[PDB]
């Protein structure tokens, strides 16, 4: 009924973003395949990045037997404390940040959509500010795949809308 | 009619956090902190630990007759530490040098015994000396890798050992510190006696420490026991008039550089395998961090303090 | 006189983000609470993330009596030096990012206002494009009200409109 | 008619910078750099350092005769270190491990001072020997801790120390090393002596080193002075035949394991109480990162070379 | 012929940003160097800050002759692991990060100069979607150069424009 | 009639990595990883490496008669080490604290070698002895910075020296180990000796150990070789009754404190100037990263394992 503005959809069920369409011959929901296979193929980068650059040294450590040499203890002691302190707080920060920039792309990667769209169809419908466009002209399943396939014409549907724009004037 | 623009919502129940905000619903999302073991001991790269049971490393590379046991493991990826094991010295002393000892053996590659000279050579002496606190079967013995030696009437006595390998050589001998004079000169026929390893120009002279110790096993003299390494292609020359027991047999070894280690560890071995152990258990880890503990020894995700650390994949799950 | 795109409000005083009006009745400022009081909370966050989650190691050090030892001493000074360089240049560089992003941040917050705002008036109004609306129609406290609440009616003005257009036209 | 979308600007002289702009003018920001201290060293959570004034800590432990005066400080949580202080060794002499006796005392728990033996309990032998270099009042004396024995004509004395408790005990005691063989003799009733301590099986053996050195007080011979912890429930047995200065007082302990720590500080000590302190004074440590000082004991923010560190909070104030 | 969203354009060769017109005088590529400048000032200095904050401290290693004292060895060898992990880590991600923004921030620059020229244009000209303007009227060099300059005249071109519309109309 | 918005792109094939894609073209980019060396071992900020070719470091300090040549280098910023010069101890021996003594001479300011006693002052023994291990011309001699003492008759000997500078002094010196009891009556006139170092109230007692090792250069006798530095404004005493080789020349110096280093390397001193040394050669160091070596001296970029790092500073290069 509402689009992105109001929130998700729990109906759309093949992929990350997309449509929903209304019309005479019925009403569905529809993912936007190209648009959801690149984000995904982005952030099965980004998690692998974040995941495979760790590869990290052969380590091997001590725990002891040793009120024996103390001054070695206790540097070693030091050593371990300020690793922790280093890897425990880049990486808490990392995640906060990192997750905030994932979720911004997720919705950068919506609008476009509304944009593309918005684009195509001008004056030939009426932005209701919502995610929806209402048309102004009458919508058949081949002009709403237009719309999704991104070749909807508009000089095609210009003059139908024309007489509708003057009839809500009156 | 109408057409419009939105993204999916679901019925995933996990949270992330953000800069901006605590707890966001999302889509999708990824672990990327490992938070469990597998609760063993287990080879490292198919190398597995050294075991030593009942017995100490020093017990063992001493040649105790009660470490008669494991077979030569050739070689070793960590050493599983035993705090008390029985088989340690059977003879009462001191060890010299344990914790460079350990950290020697922690992790060796090709690891052979080798006999460094025959005592059956050597005139105007007796060898293979005997004592009870160190027996056999219920019959007094010795250390198998170490040969006593004794009554050579303050006269002085030698020893050249080899290592003609590219590898080194681990050696391990000890010095008799004696109760009185009157026992000094009853065994090796003077009041006081020098022993002397000349590594070429190098030397080092070892006199024994007389006096009576509290008796322990019956004993109120000790020894003091030391361990060496043997550069490739060298050579020791070692001349003694009295208190030496002699390194009779060695063991070439190789270490690896990113060495083995030392863990202390109530599990016991298993035949599984692993990058990365703990004291607690092995890793899965081709995750980047963990929370499992602090020492590791392999090839470890890092170790930090967070309960879990979620990274979003999906989307702003708000129906 | 002028929106965000020439600069920010002097006269502004009760919070982040807010509408200048004009009409017959008179002019004034008034702040968007709701969009304001949701971006503090955020930066807020923000902030109390970066420190709090420091919460570090009981460490404690050593400037010995000491020409004896020296190879630990040695190590020990080593060791002082790379976590200094680790912290010093890693947190540099973080306020440098971090601030680029609250920044970011605000711009943002502020550009939805005006695209609420617009998608409301459509053609009712002309955008003046320095973050200004001139409308088309008369504009009452109760319409620039309904504007600043989301409740403004597109089709309640659109005759009064359209008139308009066709003057500006002749 | 119009409406207009606008933001705040503001009378705040704060800048900051970014990745792509050097100094923008802010609404609003906040230091995450904490840059100042409070001139005083501080107890630590309420715990206080320990602060010998006068006194070395190894004149205090032996009980010098000058030390006699700061309560038994139960515990502290870090030492003050003075590097003049006058009150040290009172009989010249030289003390054998003194950095790792700092780092063991470093931050203690419970403390209490304890008697190790009785010398009024032994035979042929005489006790509390005195000295002119230690005095009492006016009148020659000796530490307060050590016990010097003399006068055994060569024959053997012993000593048992027990630790019956959980927690470490601290020892300490010297060896007197003699000017010539004719003092040896003298005091001691023979050319050369023996001390032995037994910890069960592990021994060391002190022998004096005879000779004389610079006339320092009044003396060419010279004490060294030793020390060593005594683990929970355990004992040692000394023998000796000479040159023995031996230990009647020693300290139940229990170290914390982030232990304390040492001081170099021209302040001095102040009632109030901090969780991070440095020899500059104390720290405000809310925040995440310090300028102050590098060497640092406690909960501390991190220490950085930054002069200031400006989060943004509100907006560019492009009036 | 096409504009940004198609992609990027051989031809412009004295700046990033800029601009194609199409009119009965000709044609040609004309870079804006107010927006271009503004852009390398900044990169600039993100690229000095990342280099030029790095000045660290003085240090020496070693690589001793030494089976004879291990501890410290040992300690030492872990250290330089620790600091490699560190810092690889650390500074491959920072290089990843930092590439993903600035290609934002070029974007970002690019879709600003759009919407500053679509909001100068409204209805006297046609959004073709494409990164172009269809103007509604006839367009000399002057009337391009104001458009580049920001200072388009919207009421001096609106009637010719709106006879055109409704010529498409019909 | 149109006009169109649009972005440079570009004959430029370099590409970069994102978080969000691999390898992407770009109109422009900056490598900020330092990946080449110079191939020359230089002195740093002007100031030279210490160069002792076919010296070692013992050897050249000694004052061995085939080091008689590099200048008095009164500086510099750290050491070239040889692992195989020819010239090092000639009278054979071993030298005690080699690697502190490394450390402490790895850079130095002030350098001058200065008197610290005449032998020819000396009453009731004889000095200068030489030998033939130690040759000068053909004939035999003895180190340069050493001065043997002999023939005493078991009657001690004396020698002040003294550190009056605001610097640091740097000694060296040696104890004779005789090679038995006839030999040692021969030189000194006694059966055993001592010989005593006093710092005001600290001391050492040196003695020496007696006894044959392997005939080295014609030799069953060796020197232990010893070395110290004395503190500003100080005075050390030394008695001997014999065995003392002592210190005639020593060395005022300064240390910087972060300190210059060891540099083991094959490449040759050269004329050119650098911030930043490491023994694959030098760097220009204006870059925040390198990865060419792990062992550096110097300011120099991190070390890290990337093979390159471009950032970008152009757009998306898709025509
Ligand atoms: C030393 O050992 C290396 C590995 O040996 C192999 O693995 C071990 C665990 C044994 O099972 C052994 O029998 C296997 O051959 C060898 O690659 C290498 O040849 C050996 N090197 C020397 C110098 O002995
Ligand atoms: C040791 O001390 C712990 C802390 O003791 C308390 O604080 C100190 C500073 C004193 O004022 C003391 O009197 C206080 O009771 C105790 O919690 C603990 O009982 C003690 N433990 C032992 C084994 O003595
Ligand atoms: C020690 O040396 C410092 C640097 O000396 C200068 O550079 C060296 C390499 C020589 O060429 C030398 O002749 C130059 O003067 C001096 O700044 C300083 O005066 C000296 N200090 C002392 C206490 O001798």
């Given at each position: 009924?509402?689009?992105?503005?109001?929130?998700?959809?729990?109906?759309?069920?093949?992929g990350?973003?997309?449509?929903?369409?209304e019309?005479?011959?019925?009403?569905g929901?529809?993912?936007?395949?190209?648009?959801?296979?690149?984000?995904?193929?982005?952030?099965?980068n980004?998690?692998?990045?974040?995941?495979?650059?760790?590869?990290?040294?052969?380590?091997?450590?001590?725990?002891?037997?040793?009120?024996?040499?103390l001054?070695?203890?206790?540097?070693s002691?030091?050593?371990?404390?300020?690793?922790?302190?280093?890897?425990?707080?880049?990486?808490?920060?990392?995640?906060?940040?990192?997750?905030?920039?994932?979720?911004?792309?997720?919705?950068?990667?919506?609008?476009?959509?509304?944009?593309?769209?918005?684009?195509?169809?001008?004056?030939?419908?009426?932005?209701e500010?919502?995610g929806?466009?209402?048309?102004?002209?009458?919508?058949?399943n081949?002009?709403?795949?237009?719309?999704?396939?991104?070749?909807?014409?508009?000089?095609?549907?210009?003059?139908?809308?024309?007489?509708?724009?003057?009839?809500?004037?009156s | 009619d109408?057409?419009?623009?939105?993204?999916?919502?679901?019925?995933?129940?996990?949270?992330?956090?953000?800069?901006?905000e605590?707890?966001?619903?999302?889509?999708?999302?990824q672990?990327?902190?490992?938070?469990?073991?597998?609760?063993?001991?287990?080879?490292?790269?198919?190398?597995?630990?050294?075991?030593?049971?009942?017995?100490?490393?020093?017990?063992?590379?001493?040649?105790?007759?009660?470490?008669?046991?494991?077979?030569?493991?050739e070689?070793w990826?960590?050493?599983?530490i035993?705090?008390?094991?029985?088989?340690?010295?059977?003879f009462?002393?001191?060890?010299?040098?344990?914790?460079?000892?350990?950290?020697?053996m922690?992790?060796?590659?090709?690891?052979?015994?080798?006999?460094?000279?025959?005592?059956?050579?050597?005139?105007?002496?007796?060898?293979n000396?005997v004592?009870?606190?160190?027996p056999?079967?219920?019959?007094?013995?010795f250390?198998?890798?170490?040969?006593?030696?004794?009554?050579?009437?303050?006269?002085?006595?030698?020893?050249?050992?080899?290592?003609?390998?590219?590898?080194?050589?681990?050696?391990?001998?000890?010095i008799?510190?004696?109760?009185?004079?009157?026992?000094?000169?009853?065994?090796?026929?003077?009041?006081?006696?020098?022993?002397?390893?000349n590594?070429?120009?190098?030397?080092?002279?070892?006199?024994?420490?007389?006096?009576?110790?509290?008796?322990?096993?019956?004993?109120?003299?000790?020894?003091?026991?030391?361990?060496?390494?043997?550069?490739?292609?060298?050579?020791?020359?070692?001349?003694?008039?009295?208190?030496?027991?002699?390194?009779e047999?060695?063991?070439?070894?190789?270490?690896?550089?990113?060495?083995?280690?030392?863990?202390?560890?109530?599990?016991?071995?298993?035949?599984?395998?692993?990058?990365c152990?703990?004291?607690?258990?092995?890793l899965?880890?081709?995750?980047?961090?963990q929370?499992?503990?602090?020492?590791?020894?392999?090839?470890?995700?890092?170790?930090?303090?967070?309960?879990?650390?979620?990274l979003?994949?999906?989307?702003?799950?708000?129906?």
């Open positions: 009924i509402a689009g992105f503005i109001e929130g998700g959809w729990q109906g759309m069920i093949d990350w973003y997309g449509y929903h369409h019309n005479q011959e019925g009403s929901y529809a993912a936007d395949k190209e648009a959801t296979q690149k984000a995904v193929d982005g952030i099965t980004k998690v692998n990045s974040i995941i495979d650059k760790m590869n990290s040294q052969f380590e091997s450590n001590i725990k002891e037997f040793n009120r024996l040499e001054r070695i203890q206790h540097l002691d030091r050593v371990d404390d300020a690793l922790l302190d280093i890897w425990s707080y880049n990486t808490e920060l990392l995640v906060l940040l990192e997750n905030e920039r994932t979720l911004d792309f997720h919705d950068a990667n919506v609008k476009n959509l509304f944009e593309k769209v918005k684009a195509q169809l001008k004056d030939n419908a009426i932005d500010g919502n929806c466009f209402l048309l102004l002209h009458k919508c058949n081949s002009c709403m795949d237009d719309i999704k396939n991104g070749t909807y014409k508009y000089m095609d549907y210009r003059e139908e809308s024309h007489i509708e724009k003057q009839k809500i004037d | 109408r057409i419009c623009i939105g993204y999916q919502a679901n019925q995933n129940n996990q949270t992330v956090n953000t800069l901006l605590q707890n966001v619903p999302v889509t999708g999302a672990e990327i902190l490992e938070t469990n073991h597998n609760g063993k001991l287990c080879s490292l790269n198919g190398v597995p630990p050294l075991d030593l049971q009942s017995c100490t490393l020093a017990g063992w590379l001493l040649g105790n007759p009660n470490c008669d046991n494991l077979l030569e493991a070689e990826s960590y050493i599983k035993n705090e008390n094991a029985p088989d340690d010295l059977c009462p002393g001191n060890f010299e040098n344990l914790q460079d000892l350990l950290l020697e922690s992790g060796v590659q090709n690891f052979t015994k080798v006999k460094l000279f025959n005592p059956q050579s050597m005139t105007g002496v007796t060898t000396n004592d009870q606190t160190c056999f079967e219920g019959k007094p013995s250390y198998r890798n170490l040969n006593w030696i004794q009554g050579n009437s303050g006269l002085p006595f030698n020893i050249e050992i080899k290592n003609p390998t590219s590898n080194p050589l681990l050696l391990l001998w000890g008799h510190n004696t109760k009185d004079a009157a026992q000094q000169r009853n065994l090796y026929g003077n009041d006081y006696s020098y022993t002397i390893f590594f070429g120009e190098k030397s080092e002279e070892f006199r024994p420490d007389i006096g009576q110790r509290d008796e322990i096993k019956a004993h109120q003299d000790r020894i003091d026991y030391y361990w060496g390494s043997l550069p490739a292609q060298s050579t020791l020359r070692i001349e003694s008039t009295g208190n030496l027991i002699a390194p047999y060695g063991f070439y070894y190789k270490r690896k550089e990113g060495k083995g280690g030392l863990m202390k560890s109530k599990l016991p071995i298993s035949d599984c395998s692993t990058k152990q703990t004291p607690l258990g092995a899965n880890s081709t995750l980047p961090f929370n499992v503990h602090q020492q590791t020894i392999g090839n470890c995700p890092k170790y930090v303090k967070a309960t879990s650390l979620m979003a994949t999906g989307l702003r799950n708000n129906p």
